[PDB]
């Protein structure tokens, strides 16, 4: 799967909010382009003169994420974050020249991402009470990965002593994205666990934090809530469910070729961090069938 790379695999079956620190610093921002940020401004102008109802929004930028030594006490992860925008994304990662910016970043800064917006996404492996994961079909008329399969998620918009508020907005945003798109009540959802961070190599290396969330409703009740919003309550065109039993071999199915890179990231991290048992009981052959 060349279109997805793992940046972080979390320990302990995944990390809760209270074990993560963030450092939000202008040292973690995109570097100005070599010939100047006028090139981003020019792309934006062209776009607004065709689609004048579009608007900019601030986004978090991922610089890097450092895991503590495994088995340690105290905070287990440091997220190094900067700020970027939807405009900066359109002028860098989305640009036809994005590969030239990556080579220039290697040359000038020893950092393939130095000249890229790299907005941070969130996604969820969302499990039902009857042990299915939740999938969504993308519209064939959208910009990103038209007609492909996705999981619930989005790109959070901003508003350890500013840090803890930032970690809170990241965990809050994955629940809000599930409530807005799947139409589920907030009280049916568990507190999220962070599984890891995946990069989309088809969008010049931008990263998404992938979370595990449990729902107290069955697949049938989740479907009812999604459909009862009507066509205007969701951006997706359909919902469907795969047994957690069968997610283990999803990369061997015809479904895999239809998954967008960020959904492939969520399923790889679910399989490595929540699947793949380590103990004698769950590792026994009748519960973990060989092949
Ligand atoms: C690929 C695409 O269109 N996206 C994903 C990145 C996000 C930002 N910023 C919103 C739009």
Summarize the structure.
With 291 residues, the chain is α+β, with helices and mostly antiparallel strands. 28% of the residues lie in helices and 24% in strands. It is built from 8 helices and 11 strands.
SSE layout and pairings?
Elements: E1 4-9, E2 20-24, H1 38-48, E3 58-67, E4 77-85, H2 86-91, H3 98-109, E5 121-127, E6 132-137, E7 149-150, E8 153-154, H4 163-182, E9 193-200, E10 206-214, H5 219-228, E11 238-243, H6 244-247, H7 261-274, H8 280-283
Parallel strand pairs: 2-4, 5-10
Antiparallel strand pairs: 1-9, 3-4, 5-8, 6-7, 6-11, 9-10
The protein binds 1-ethanoylpiperidine-4-carbonitrile (S1V).
Residues 59, 86, 89, 119, 143-144, 155, 203 line the site of 1-ethanoylpiperidine-4-carbonitrile.
PDB class: hydrolase
Keywords: PanDDA, SGC - Diamond I04-1 fragment screening, NUDIX domain, XChemExplorer, nucleoside diphosphate-linked moiety X motif 22, hydrolase
Assembly: monomeric
Written overview of the protein:
With 291 residues, the protein is α+β, with helices and mostly antiparallel strands. The chain has one domain. Helix content is 28%, strand content 24%. It is built from eight helices and eleven strands. It has helices spanning 38-48, 86-91, 98-109, 163-182, 219-228, 244-247, 261-274, 280-283, and strands at 4-9, 20-24, 58-67, 77-85, 121-127, 132-137, 149-150, 153-154, 193-200, 206-214, 238-243. Strands 1-9-10-5-8 form a five-stranded mixed beta sheet, sandwiched between helices. A three-stranded mixed beta sheet has the order 2-4-3. The longest helix has 20 residues, at 163-182. It is globular, with a radius of gyration of 20 Å. 36% of the residues are buried. Bound molecules: 1-ethanoylpiperidine-4-carbonitrile (S1V). 1-ethanoylpiperidine-4-carbonitrile (S1V) binds at residues 59, 86, 89, 119, 143-144, 155, 203.
């Amino acid at each position: 799967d060349p279109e997805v790379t793992l940046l972080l695999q979390c320990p302990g079956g995944g990390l809760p909010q209270e074990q993560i620190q963030a450092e939000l610093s202008p040292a973690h921002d995109r570097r100005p382009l070599p010939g100047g940020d006028e090139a981003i401004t020019a792309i934006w102008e062209t776009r607004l003169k065709a689609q004048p109802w579009l608007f900019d929004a601030p986004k978090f930028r991922l610089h890097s994420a450092t895991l503590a030594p495994i088995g340690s006490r105290g905070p287990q992860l440091l997220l190094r974050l900067g700020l970027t925008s939807y405009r900066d994304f359109l002028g860098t990662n989305w640009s036809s020249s994005a590969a030239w910016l990556r080579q220039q970043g290697a040359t000038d800064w020893g950092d393939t991402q130095a000249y890229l917006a790299d907005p941070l996404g969130v996604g969820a492996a969302l499990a039902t009470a009857d042990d299915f994961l939740v999938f969504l079909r993308r519209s064939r008329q959208v910009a990103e990965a038209p007609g492909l399969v996705d999981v619930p998620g989005g790109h959070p918009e901003p508003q350890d002593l500013a840090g803890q508020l930032v970690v809170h907005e990241l965990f809050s945003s994955v629940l809000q994205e599930i409530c807005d798109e799947v139409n589920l009540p907030l009280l049916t959802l568990s507190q999220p666990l962070l599984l890891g961070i995946a990069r989309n190599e088809t969008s010049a290396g931008r990263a998404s934090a992938e979370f595990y969330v449990q729902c107290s409703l069955t697949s049938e009740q989740v479907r009812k809530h999604y459909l009862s919003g009507g066509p205007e309550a969701h951006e997706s065109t359909g919902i469907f469910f795969v047994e957690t039993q069968n997610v283990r071999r999803l990369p061997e199915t015809e479904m895999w070729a239809e998954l967008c890179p960020s959904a492939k990231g969520a399923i790889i991290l679910y399989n490595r961090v929540q699947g793949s048992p380590t103990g004698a009981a769950l590792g026994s052959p009748a519960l973990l069938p060989p092949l």
